[model samples]
Target: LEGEVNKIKSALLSTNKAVVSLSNGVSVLTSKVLDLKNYIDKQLLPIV
Candidate 1:
C-alpha cells in the first residue's frame, strides 16, 4: 500500500528526469546539426 505507492512515485520521478534530460540532448543535437549545415554552406562550399 503506502510502501508500494512510494516506490512507484520514486520510479516516476526518475523517469521524469530521464525524459527531461533526453529532450534536452535532442534539442542540443538539432541545434548543432543546423549550425553544421550553415557552416558547410557558408564556409566549406566556398573552398570545395
Candidate 2:
C-alpha cells in the first residue's frame, strides 16, 4: 500500500512538473490534470 501510494505521488508530481515545464514551448490544458493531482495528493496526506 505504501509503495502504491508513493508511486502515485511520484507519478502525479512528475506529470505536473512535465506539463508545466513543457508549457514554455506551447500551451496545454493542464489545469484539470493539476487539479486532479492536487486532489489526490491531499487525500494521501493523512495516510502519508
Candidate 3:
C-alpha cells in the first residue's frame, strides 16, 4: 500500500499547481477588472 505514495505525491503536486494557477488567475483578473470598473463608475457617477 505504501509503495504508491510517491506516485500519489506527484499527482497531488500537479493538481495543486493547477489549483494555484486558477486561483491566481481569478484573483489577479478580478482585482484588475474590479478596480477599473469601480474607478470608472465612481468617476462617471460623480460627473452625472
Candidate 4:
C-alpha cells in the first residue's frame, strides 16, 4: 500500500475512521441532549 492509488487509500481509511468517530459523537451528543432535557424537567425548574 505504497503507491499513487494507495496514497489516499490510507488517507481515505483515516478519513473514514474520523467521520465514523464524528457520527458516534453526534449520536452521543444527541443522546446527552435528550438526557439534559429530562434533567431540566426533573429538577432544573424556575428559569427566571
C-alpha RMSD of each candidate structure in angstroms: 1.1, 19.4, 2.1, 3.1
What do the candidate models score in CA lDDT, each in turn?
0.99, 0.81, 0.92, 0.89
Name the better of 2 and 3 by lDDT.
Answer: 3
Across 12-33, the per-residue lDDT of candidate 2 in tens digits comes to 9999999888895354457777
Per-residue alpha-carbon lDDT of candidate 1 for residues 1-48, written as tens digits (9 for 90 to 100): 999999999999999999999999999999999999999999999999
lDDT of candidate 4 over 1-48, digit per residue (tens): 369779888889999999999999999999999999988987777562
lDDT of 3 by residue, 1-48 (tens): 575998899889999999999999999999999989898898877898
- lDDT-sorted candidate list, best first: 1, 3, 4, 2
Question: Which pairs in model 1 have colliding backbones?
Answer: none
All candidates: TM-score: 0.81, 0.48, 0.66, 0.70
Of the two candidates 1 and 2, the one with more favorable TM-score, higher being better, is 1
Candidate 1 Cα lDDT to native: 0.99
Q: For model 4, what is the alpha-carbon lDDT of residue 30? A: 100
lDDT for position 40 in model 4: 91
In model 2, the runs with Cα more than 4 Å from the true position are 27-48
